[PDB]
Amino acid sequence: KASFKASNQKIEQIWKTQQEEIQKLNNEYSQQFMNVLQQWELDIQKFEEQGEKLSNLFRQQQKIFQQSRIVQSQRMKAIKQIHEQFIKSLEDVEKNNTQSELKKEMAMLQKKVMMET
Amino acid sequence: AKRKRIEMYTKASFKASNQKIEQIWKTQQEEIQKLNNEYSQQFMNVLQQWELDIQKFEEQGEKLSNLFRQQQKIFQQSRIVQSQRMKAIKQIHEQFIKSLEDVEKNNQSELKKEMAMLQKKVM
Amino acid sequence: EMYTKASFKASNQKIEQIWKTQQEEIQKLNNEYSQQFMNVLQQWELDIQKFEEQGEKLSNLFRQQQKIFQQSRIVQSQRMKAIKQIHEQFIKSLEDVEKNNDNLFELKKEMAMLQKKVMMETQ
Amino acid sequence: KRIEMYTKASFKASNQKIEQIWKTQQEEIQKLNNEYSQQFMNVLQQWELDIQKFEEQGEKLSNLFRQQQKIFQQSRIVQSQRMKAIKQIHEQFIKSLEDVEKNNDNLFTGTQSELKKEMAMLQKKVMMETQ
């Protein structure tokens, strides 16, 4: 059956060369596909790390917010004191005060006047 | 009696002009207190409003922190799904490729089986 | 002779269908992969553009925060100007009172008249 | 004659002692208000610095955000650049495959035609080997 076997191989050749074509096309695709898919995962990473940076820039601006608050609150309190003391310390000045030291200078002047009469 | 009249008169004269001089001072020092009273109130009323300012600043910022908690939690999920689709297609592709790979490995046994039927039928 | 042409043609029919089947088995694979692929890609596209919307959302939360800061600064500035002025007007108005008080030391009038009284009442 | 001289000069000295009393008191008050003015103004100068330090920080943080926002937007350009890139590759894949199929279907030079030919070529060979 040599005639049958010779034409049996000539058919499979027809087949497999055809199928070889389709496979070379799939290899080329895959290779190309996976290459670009790989660098795409890299860029996808940076794009999330840039999502990070912005989201950190806000939390930073949040901290500023509270620091200013505290600062504001510390300044107002320092002023209030300074003022409360000033007021206290004038109240002590009023207690230190003279209208009798006036009576004394007046009394003396009275003595002086009586004498010379 | 004459002398004792004049003693009394000057003592009187001095008392009265004591009260005068002391009222003079009293009136000024009270003018002064009015200025300082008016001052510290004005003063206090601005410290009062600086404190309202600070609280309305707090509340406005407390509300941003909550809004940012929201947008961040969504943005984080949005970020997780993008890596998930990433895993999904790499898999769809790798599968499609093994299937075509396995298809080739399986590929032919019916061709020879037909030739053998045919040859047997030609015999 | 005539039979073998008949079996030959039947054999060619089975071969043809064998080839056509597998060919159609490949292209079902190619079509189901390329349909999946497209479905995800379109999806992932939307889920990419959704990240931007969340990102543009944050730069608006950012500019809002910045806007809050400009107003607290302006107000703080305006408050400090109010207070510096109240204090300045205070100080000034003490200076003003101190001038009117060089009139008071009035005491010299009291002391004159007292003298005159005492003088006349012993001379 | 000497009496009248004694009462004048006694009143004057008594008068400048009264005035001096009032004077000292007023200087004492003045010194307080001075100090308080200093302490006050000191806290105003700090508060003024605090304002401008807050502003400088937030002005810097906003530029960092400007820059990082551009850097972000370029990264979306990159993303959709990979989209098109991948879409093309797959599309050209499918084109390549339909071309391969169209060529494998040519009635004259397809793969069935090459099959039939060799089949007929076997048949002709088998029937002359009998005759």
Author numbering:
A (entry chain D): 115 to 211, 218 to 237
B (entry chain C): 105 to 211, 219 to 234
C (entry chain B): 111 to 215, 221 to 238
D (entry chain A): 108 to 238
Recite the paper's sentences.
We found that Mm SYCP3CC also forms homotetramers in the absence of SYCP2CC (not shown), and when we determined the structure of Mm SYCP3CC by x-ray crystallography, we observed an antiparallel coiled-coil homotetramer similar in structure to H. sapiens SYCP3. We found that the SYCP2CC:SYCP3CC heterotetramer is more stable than SYCP3CC on its own (56.0°C Tm versus 52.5°C), supporting the idea that the heterotetrameric complex is the preferred state when both proteins are present. Overall, these data show that the SYCP2CC:SYCP3CC complex forms an extended coiled-coil tetramer with an overall structure similar to that of the SYCP3 homotetramer. Using sequence alignments and the structures of H. sapiens and M. musculus SYCP3, we generated physical models for SYCP2:SYCP3 where the monomers are arranged either parallel or antiparallel, and mapped all identified crosslinks onto these models.
Mammals possess two such proteins, SYCP2 (1500 residues in Mus musculus) and SYCP3 (254 residues), which are both required for proper axis formation and wild-type levels of crossovers, and are known to interact with one another through their C-terminal coiled-coil domains. Mammalian SYCP3 is known to form coiled-coil homotetramers that self-associate into larger structures both in cell culture and in vitro, but how SYCP3 cooperates with SYCP2 to mediate chromosome localization and axis assembly is not known. We further show that both SYCP2/SYCP3 and ASY3/ASY4 form heterotetrameric coiled-coil complexes that self-assemble into extended filaments, paralleling our findings with Red1.
